[PDB]
Amino acid sequence: VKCQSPPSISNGRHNGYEDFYTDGSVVTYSCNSGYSLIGNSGVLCSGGEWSDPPTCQIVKCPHPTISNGYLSSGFKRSYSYNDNVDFKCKYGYKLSGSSSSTCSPGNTWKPELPKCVR
């Protein structure tokens, strides 16, 4: 079975510069202007059947805040499936969680924000 252009997805486009694909192929699904492409950056048609489709959602995280352990590496008014902020524990405190997070594609700071503890 051959593989023609993949179907549409969650508010996102597909196909780059072709139409077929047969098998062992992949398709980077495009997302609306401002939508982050989560999931494998390319579908996978293997046997006339497309598989492993990524998502096209929004990933504007809140703020990589934390208890006396802010990032201290690079913060911004807003983020998007990226902006990996490194968390710096204030003083004599340990980050309980993760000393390095990035605005994930789910509108948040993944991994969970660290908690400068003692």
From Swiss-Prot:
Coiled coil: none annotated. Disulfide bonds join C3-C45, C31-C56, C61-C103, C89-C116. It is found in: Virion membrane; Host cell membrane; Secreted. Residues 1-58, 59-118 form the Sushi domain. It comes from the Viruses. Heterodimer with A56 protein; disulfide-linked. Serves to protect the virus against complement attack by inhibiting both classical and alternative pathways of complement activation. Binds C3b and C4b. Belongs to the receptors of complement activation (RCA) family. This is Complement control protein C3. The chain holds residues 146 to 263 of 263 of the full protein.
